[PDB]
Every structure is written in structure tokens, then in C-alpha cells.
């Protein structure tokens, strides 16, 4: 197994994984065979780190995770898209504090509900840099760990809501992490 502990992408036992942090050192992520992962995480700042896709789409994929934060953390499906800028999140768990954003609807799918939500964030990092960006929502109204997340259900209800995706960069499922410590581990596969 690869330990990473510096910002990269790259390629591991046949997936792009991605590894990014504001706080080198608070943070690992060990690249274990086909789609599996885990992180260590500890007074971190910032970080996101997955295994997936290195160019999104309508994929239905399954994942069996280990989730377990001490402070706010997600477990999320995360990716980008160009033209337009957006960063989005399906998310499946999260640690001390659910994330909310402004209400746009709901959407079922995959046996849970989630709300739907959109943000804008002020001069922050992004795939081309520093810039300002949306980002657009799901949040499961109850958290679970393992399960099918029907992609291509979620991009529909965010058009169906005006929320408009562009050209698709990367696409993970992710562990994030704000200020807290804990681990994971995260298994995915088409």
C-alpha cells in the first residue's frame, strides 16, 4: 500500500484517486487494492481525498465505508465540472454538523430522501485556482455508510431546480474533513 501525503492525483490499482489538503502533516491517505482507501486525520484544516473517476458522469455506484470523525467531517460523493465552475456533493454521512446551504428541493432516490441545496464560495480553491464558485447539494436526511448512489437521479433533480452542471472533471467518493480529527475507510466501484 501508498501512502500520500502531499496534494496529487494519480492512478492506484486501476482508479484515479485525488489528495488534497491545506494542512500537510494533519493528514494522510493509504491507497489500498482496486477502489479502497483510508485517511488519517488529526487537528487537521482542510482536506478531501478519494478514490473514483478522473472524468465524471451519470455513473451508478456502490460504496461500503468506515466513517468515523471526531468533529465535522463528510462522507460524500464530490466532484467539478467547467463551463460552468461547480464543485457538488451528494452526502451520505457526516460527523458533528449536517451541511445545509439554500433550500432548493428534495429529491428521492436510492431508498433516502435528501434536501437539496446550493452555495456560493468567496475566493477559495478550485480546479483552475483560486476563484468564486458554486456548489450544488445533496444531503441525505438520514446518514448512512454503504449503499448505490444513483448519480444521474441527483444531476436531474439539480436541473430540475435550475442548478446547471457543465463539463465534468474529476468525480470521488470522498472523505472531507474541516478542523477535526478522525479515519475512514471507503470502497467504491462502478
Do not use: C
Given at each position: 500500500?501508498?501512502?500520500?501525503?502531499?496534494?496529487?492525483?494519480?492512478?492506484?490499482?486501476?482508479?484515479?484517486?485525488?489528495?488534497?489538503?491545506?494542512?500537510?502533516?494533519?493528514?494522510?491517505?493509504?491507497?489500498?487494492?482496486?477502489?479502497?482507501?483510508?485517511?488519517?486525520?488529526?487537528?487537521?484544516?482542510?482536506?478531501?481525498?478519494?478514490?473514483?473517476?478522473?472524468?465524471?458522469?451519470?455513473?451508478?455506484?456502490?460504496?461500503?465505508?468506515?466513517?468515523?470523525?471526531?468533529?465535522?467531517?463528510?462522507?460524500t460523493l464530490?466532484?467539478?465540472?467547467?463551463?460552468?465552475?461547480?464543485?457538488y456533493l451528494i452526502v451520505e454521512?457526516?460527523?458533528?454538523?449536517?451541511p445545509?446551504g439554500?433550500?432548493k428541493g428534495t429529491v428521492t432516490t436510492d431508498?433516502g430522501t435528501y434536501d437539496i441545496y446550493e452555495?456560493?464560495?468567496?475566493?477559495?480553491?478550485?480546479?483552475?485556482?483560486?476563484?468564486?464558485?458554486?456548489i450544488f447539494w445533496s444531503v441525505r436526511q438520514?446518514?448512512?455508510?454503504?449503499?448505490?448512489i444513483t448519480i444521474?437521479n441527483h444531476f436531474d433533480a439539480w436541473?430540475?431546480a435550475?442548478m446547471?452542471?457543465?463539463?465534468?472533471?474529476?468525480?470521488?467518493?470522498?472523505?472531507?474533513?474541516?478542523?477535526?480529527?478522525?479515519?475512514?475507510?471507503?470502497?467504491?466501484?462502478?
Amino acid at each position: 500500500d501508498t501512502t500520500i501525503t502531499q496534494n496529487q492525483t494519480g492512478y492506484d490499482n486501476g482508479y484515479f484517486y485525488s489528495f488534497w489538503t491545506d494542512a500537510p502533516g494533519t493528514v494522510s491517505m493509504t491507497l489500498h487494492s482496486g477502489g479502497s482507501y483510508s485517511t488519517s486525520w488529526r487537528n487537521t484544516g482542510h482536506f478531501k481525498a478519494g478514490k473514483g473517476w478522473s472524468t465524471g458522469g451519470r455513473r451508478t455506484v456502490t460504496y461500503n465505508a468506515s466513517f468515523n470523525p471526531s468533529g465535522d467531517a463528510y462522507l460524500t460523493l464530490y466532484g467539478w465540472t467547467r463551463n460552468p465552475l461547480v464543485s457538488y456533493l451528494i452526502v451520505e454521512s457526516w460527523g458533528t454538523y449536517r451541511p445545509t446551504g439554500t433550500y432548493k428541493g428534495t429529491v428521492t432516490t436510492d431508498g433516502g430522501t435528501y434536501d437539496i441545496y446550493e452555495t456560493w464560495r468567496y475566493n477559495a480553491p478550485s480546479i483552475e485556482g483560486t476563484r468564486t464558485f458554486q456548489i450544488f447539494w445533496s444531503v441525505r436526511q438520514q446518514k448512512r455508510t454503504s449503499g448505490t448512489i444513483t448519480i444521474g437521479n441527483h444531476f436531474d433533480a439539480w436541473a430540475r431546480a435550475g442548478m446547471n452542471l457543465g463539463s465534468h472533471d474529476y468525480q470521488i467518493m470522498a472523505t472531507k474533513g474541516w478542523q477535526s480529527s478522525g479515519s475512514s475507510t471507503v470502497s467504491i466501484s462502478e
